[PDB]
Structure 1
Amino acid sequence: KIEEGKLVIWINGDKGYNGLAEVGKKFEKDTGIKVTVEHPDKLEEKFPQVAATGDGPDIIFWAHDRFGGYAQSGLLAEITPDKAFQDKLYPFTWDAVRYNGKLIAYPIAVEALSLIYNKDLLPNPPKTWEEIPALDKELKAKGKSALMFNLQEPYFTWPLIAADGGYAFKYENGKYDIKDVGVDNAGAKAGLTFLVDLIKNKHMNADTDYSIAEAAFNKGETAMTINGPWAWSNIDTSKVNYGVTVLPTFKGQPSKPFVGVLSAGINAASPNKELAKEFLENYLLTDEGLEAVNKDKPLGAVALKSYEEELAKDPRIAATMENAQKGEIMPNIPQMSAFWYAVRTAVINAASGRQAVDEALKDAQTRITK
């Protein structure tokens, strides 16, 4: 079914697949084994279909959170890196690729939101959320605003909501406790209260969405936004001299953005598991391998320490990794699907006044733990 003696790799069409193919060509030169890199449409839908019948690629690349469902269906091989190899990657990245206590993928790259700021409006960006109200008053007096970011989606508001002690699900022992949910605790209530107050006191509008925040920042109307590495290429550097830094703290605690870890899984049905391990450990997860992919399409921050130390000479990448290290690995369990919709509703209702902050989060907590 899956052909022995070659590697077929699937990766999304927004990634550096020409760079990956060059890594494959080096592997083929050293081993005589053909590597075929493909970027099919809807690969994350296709993989569980073909893998369920014992078919598909030998290696799949995707964000780690989707691999939980794949691992629940036994579609991914348990990987076997030795302890010395594991020590070459930042330890938090291995946690992202554990399911039911077992390692099911190799971490490649790390993504998280950062604070993006306009250096000509704000050469010294605020280190705390608590400073932002006063800063907004000063900037509004000069015809600008302090901060605009997407308020409609919990991915973007969670960093603040969770800073003072919120969390989705408690992680321990390579597993999550589905009964230990941090959506209606004191810290979450404090952060959502602070967000709602930003709106009540006219520092942000409740209808601000992704489009508005991006346009406002690119036009030089707002000093700051919150966004991820996918947004950098769109920032009009002709008009905006921007920096990227650590997110502000709240009550002295770091903001807690969700962390996505681009990961490489090995099909459980592959007869090429040793070749796949060799390719991933000793060709891709090297400075030269990650450089080839990154040159094609930037990976952002990477899990491999040796190469991250080079990439972090770019302060935007250094900030991405700092915010990731302080953030919350996105849980890979099925109960996380309940989290997104429950918290989305809670934030919308609190920002509109439909619900008090406490009731909004209480209702979300009840749905997530149900």
Structure 2
Amino acid sequence: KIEEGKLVIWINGDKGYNGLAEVGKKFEKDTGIKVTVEHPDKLEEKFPQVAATGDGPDIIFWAHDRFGGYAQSGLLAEITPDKAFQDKLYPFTWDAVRYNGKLIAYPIAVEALSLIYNKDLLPNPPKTWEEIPALDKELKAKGKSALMFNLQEPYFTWPLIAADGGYAFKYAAGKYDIKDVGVDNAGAKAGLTFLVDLIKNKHMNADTDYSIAEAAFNKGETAMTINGPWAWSNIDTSVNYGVTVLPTFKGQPSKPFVGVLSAGINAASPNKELAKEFLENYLLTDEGLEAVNKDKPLGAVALKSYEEELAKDPRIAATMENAQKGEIMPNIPQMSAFWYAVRTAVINAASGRQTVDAALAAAQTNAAAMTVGTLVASVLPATVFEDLAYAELYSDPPGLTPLPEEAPLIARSVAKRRNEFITVRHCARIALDQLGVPPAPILKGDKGEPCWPDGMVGSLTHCAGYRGAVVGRRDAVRSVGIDAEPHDVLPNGVLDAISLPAERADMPRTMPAALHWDRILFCAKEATYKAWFPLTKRWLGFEDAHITFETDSTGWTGRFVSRILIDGSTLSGPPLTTLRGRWSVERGLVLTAIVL
């Protein structure tokens, strides 16, 4: 339910969202249409999760790299600006938002990282990465540090990894080869090894994140940081700073990945024409962009008339100099896998979990395993999106490995078991990363129940043609149970063992004739057990729950309620007398989920 006659906009919390809300107010005053701007955490991961249910914002702002994934899952409207409107924006910006022959967002601004330094602590910034250990030694003696920047997001480390030859996907003939991944070559290993040595030699701390680095720079405790244009506003309020070219590595320029902040329209919006009017006639004007830019700088904007003014800011000149040395990101759907793979490699190598060589070998494998599918998202409650995450795969990608801690669980297991175990736990680690949790082994405990990291709950499922994981923050979600089954009739004799007479009477009457209601019931019973057992530590048989279904008007998705016939007491907390879930049949599979 996206509300008709209003706009909801998502944009990242480090950007000028208050400025954008001012453009929103102007729009309301002219047209009567209320504009609500929100900035949820991890919105780049939450958007598909909610847009899959037909929910979410009318308009989503993010760097262009994520948009191909959204388009592949059918989540974006096609954009068709007219001739005069296209001519108002730089051509390379339209190319950024073009995917498979269609425009999938409006380009807004060009972002690239620069080196930002405190001129009073450091009147001459370092030209090379290699001189930074020496500089940190000198600064540490004065009670300061040379450099702090966000080590938790690979965006900030990539310029160094790419400098001496790291790359994401090989480009040729206007086309990216997803089988030629450049994260494990000599150049990438050299850059990452330099970073890990900085940490080992106590020149940086592996836990430094965005807020830590920003606070340290803006209070004058560190001489340098690496950040984008959005960051300048907070500094300006604190420091006499310069924005300059990133240091070289092995004498080669650092090569940041360049983003074009872009605005896409939800394919489920009933407000597409209003969204287009807003973007074309209110935002992408000098006045609109100025409103946002004065809140937090956008970078070099896509609109030529205003970029001609901003280009005179020497901070923007520095921005474009670093952008020229770097590369525009791909927008292919495999980008989200690339990023997960590099995030994880960097974090594991920085913390000691893996050697650089192991961390990057694994990234090269993982960057293959794209997870932009949304089948299970369709059975999750959008209202709790901030505390849930998911990932799914429809095959077993080659070369995935279990974590060393997990390996004993499948050491004497059959091949199909080894594959489903490894693949589903990869999904689990992708989902956990969405909630901000680093890589952890997922072991098996009481009656085979999966063992989650502190503060997390979840569920796993694997059948023919599917592996999926859903994870939740335990401070908001008591338990999760999910289950996938092939959408086939049940084998002989199974329906009677798994069902009650009333279910057999009611369901064929309630469900569309096209659906294998027998298998759907069985899938829901299994999800019920998975949600149940972590909280009760007791058996629940198929005959111990009576499940009733309802069907949405689409005919392919709905709700169910499982009423428990035995003692529903839990070890702590409210009893599980009933459990509510959702079901969906799509792509040959049945998905069910319960979030308690």
Q: What TM-score do the two structures reach when normalised by structure 1? A: 0.78
Residue equivalent to 2:128: 128
Q: Distance in 2 between matches of 1:149 and 1:35?
A: 34
Taking a change above 3 Å as real, the CA distance of residues 190 and 134 of structure 1, as seen in their structure-2 partners, is same
Deviations 1:89-113 (A, max 9, x none): 3444334322234221111123333
Deviations 1:250-306 (A, max 9, x none): 233332233333212234456765665454334432222312333355434322233
Q: Distance in 2 between matches of 1:43 and 1:294?
A: 21
Unmatched tracts of structure 1, length 5 or more: none
Whether contact under 8 Å (1:245, 1:315) holds in the other structure is no
Shift in Å at residue 192 of structure 1? 1.6
Which deviates the most, 357-366 or 47-56? 47-56
Residue equivalent to 1:369: 595
- Higher CA-based Rg: 2
Deviations 1:196-247 (A, max 9, x none): 3334455334454445534443343322122234443444855x22222221
Whether contact under 8 Å (2:148, 2:226) holds in the other structure is yes
Taking a change above 3 Å as real, the CA distance of residues 170 and 81 of structure 1, as seen in their structure-2 partners, is farther
Shift in Å at residue 315 of structure 1? 3.3
Taking a change above 3 Å as real, the CA distance of residues 237 and 58 of structure 1, as seen in their structure-2 partners, is closer
Residue equivalent to 2:249: 250
Q: Distance in 1 between matches of 2:206 and 2:43?
A: 36
Residue equivalent to 1:271: 270
> Secondary structure of 1:37's match?
strand
Q: Distance in 2 between matches of 1:213 and 1:13?
A: 16
Structure of greater relative contact order (alpha carbons < 8 Å, 6+ residues apart):
1
Taking a change above 3 Å as real, the CA distance of residues 369 and 253 of structure 1, as seen in their structure-2 partners, is farther
RMSD value over aligned CA atoms? Answer: 4.9
Which deviates the most, 165-174 or 124-133? 165-174
Q: What TM-score do the two structures reach when normalised by structure 2? A: 0.52
Q: Distance in 1 between matches of 2:213 and 2:248?
A: 21
Which deviates the most, 226-235 or 241-250? 226-235
The sequence identity of aligned pairs, in percent, is: 98
Taking a change above 3 Å as real, the CA distance of residues 334 and 121 of structure 1, as seen in their structure-2 partners, is same
Q: Distance in 1 between matches of 2:200 and 2:47?
A: 46
Taking a change above 3 Å as real, the CA distance of residues 171 and 280 of structure 1, as seen in their structure-2 partners, is farther
Shift in Å at residue 188 of structure 1? 0.7
Unmatched tracts of structure 2, length 5 or more: 367-593
Shift in Å at residue 311 of structure 1? 2.3
Q: Distance in 2 between matches of 1:287 and 1:165?
A: 39
Whether contact under 8 Å (1:149, 1:226) holds in the other structure is yes
Shift in Å at residue 327 of structure 1? 3.2
Q: Distance in 1 between matches of 2:258 and 2:176?
A: 16
Q: Distance in 2 between matches of 1:97 and 1:134?
A: 42
Q: Distance in 2 between matches of 1:209 and 1:317?
A: 25
Deviations 1:141-168 (A, max 9, x none): 5444322323344232221111122122
Total equivalences in the alignment = 369
Taking a change above 3 Å as real, the CA distance of residues 101 and 247 of structure 1, as seen in their structure-2 partners, is farther
Whether contact under 8 Å (2:230, 2:297) holds in the other structure is no
Deviations 1:54-112 (A, max 9, x none): 77765443443443232112232322235664454344433432223422111112333
Residue equivalent to 1:86: 86
Taking a change above 3 Å as real, the CA distance of residues 271 and 211 of structure 1, as seen in their structure-2 partners, is closer
Shift in Å at residue 34 of structure 1? 8.3
Deviations 1:3-25 (A, max 9, x none): 99987766567755665466567
Residue equivalent to 2:349: 350
> Secondary structure of 1:264's match?
strand
Residue equivalent to 2:315: 316
Deviations 1:115-147 (A, max 9, x none): 111101111212322332343344445444322
Whether contact under 8 Å (1:10, 1:38) holds in the other structure is yes
